[PDB]
Amino acid sequence: NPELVQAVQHVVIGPSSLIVHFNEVIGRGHFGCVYHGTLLKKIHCAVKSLNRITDIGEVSQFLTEGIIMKDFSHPNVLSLLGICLRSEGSPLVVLPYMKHGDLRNFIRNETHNPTVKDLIGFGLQVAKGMKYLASKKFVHRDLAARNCMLDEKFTVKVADFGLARDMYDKEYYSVHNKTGAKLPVKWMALESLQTQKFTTKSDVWSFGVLLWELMTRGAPPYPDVNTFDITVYLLQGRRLLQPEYCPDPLYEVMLKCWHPKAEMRPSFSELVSRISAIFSTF
Template identity: 30%
Template structure:
């Protein structure tokens, strides 16, 4: 049964005209190939080539991500490429400030439990030629953050409403599964952890290395001493104020992903700079951390560019998810239902 706050929030989301929305539900994903190790097996002996022999796709805390082009099958048919997350040498064997190897192993355990069309698929946990632990996953082609950066550099405006809707629908479905079926929060939701194939044909959530286990009622952490990591600009007020972490903490970050696609910016980062321009310039610009830190956990303003009526539902959803009081935010389950309702 939906909670009182879910019912209240849903009322503000339903009554929106949505003729412009024509989402395509992701097809049921295919089973993993025979090259994929069994879900309960230990790290496979699959060898990952040295880094110079793979194309670099991106990076994260303590890791680099590479594209692994796999050799054809014996019958000559091709194999899909994998994305390989590899620990950087600085962070091997406990070096550095973060236990990256522990996060990678934890992510592998969580990914092997999952089976959802909007969550990246596990492929293998293995060692590279230099002994680095590597997590292999399906290749998601491109990150949403990268797409946002390219669109901004090209001088384009917000993403079309239908594309933002597709991302919102896909992520709500992934979070509903993660929260209600597996009892986890993602813990670091942002555009950089959203993968897109093609022209938004498929949208998948990735990077579960800092996910945290929830209580059965979703209103707290199973282990209250667990640390929420996240990324500062996307973290909810309860993270910054050392409040209770619940499933609604993910929903704040979810709302900011919608905002990113409308504004083509990262939340609050413009406040780090003072001067005539938000771009960094040694001569004219200086960092102003106080204003930035004061804004963390709050709702950023909508872009100055006038958004047409096609964006009205998305604006309402963004505003509902970024309420500072977590009890007033919609749950992933309610958000998914509201998104599906506007298809009618």
């Protein structure tokens, strides 16, 4: 498609400008692995392979869906460095290197031992990136602690969307839902599990879950709820319990994020205010 081609060409990177270390895997997704690469004056970057997508139609659909990523610019949103097209193989997606990897592995690491304040700060950052994406009317559909990255300045990048989209930890995606496709059902809003529709308000639901992951330092949500039972569990009005070290007012925020009525849930702009106030009392 010539239109998709014009868009891609805005961000194309010539094969000569990119060195990829295929012996240095730093990420594993369903569409391909992530590698240490260098972009040219050498910039250290992360190179996401799409090679597992071999069908040209599907490659076209993925590029079509994710290309808008080049139009986003915000300190808490992961940016696109470019796309490297070559003579043999699927396009390589080139992204900025994130020195501290994904937020979930970061807060789970026991030498790190992040404080309550550090954790609420991380959540404030995500709230702000999500606030920007919502203002662009972009719906994420897979927000979770595993899907936010941390750069060398400990700035949190909302990630795993657009051209970087993939399943980077397979254990938390299940076919036990109405679509039959692999979905993150334990981060999904109740109405999304029922109607298969995703909105910014269902993103807010996910953000609530991510907040919970933060305060538990990366505990898996509903460890005792089988993927078969997640929908009925939420229908009965049950929710994630308050983490031991979560401040009461922040747990109140989580609960609002999981209000059964989508319209009744806060906006990300409101969440930035409330969490910013909570963070400041630390």
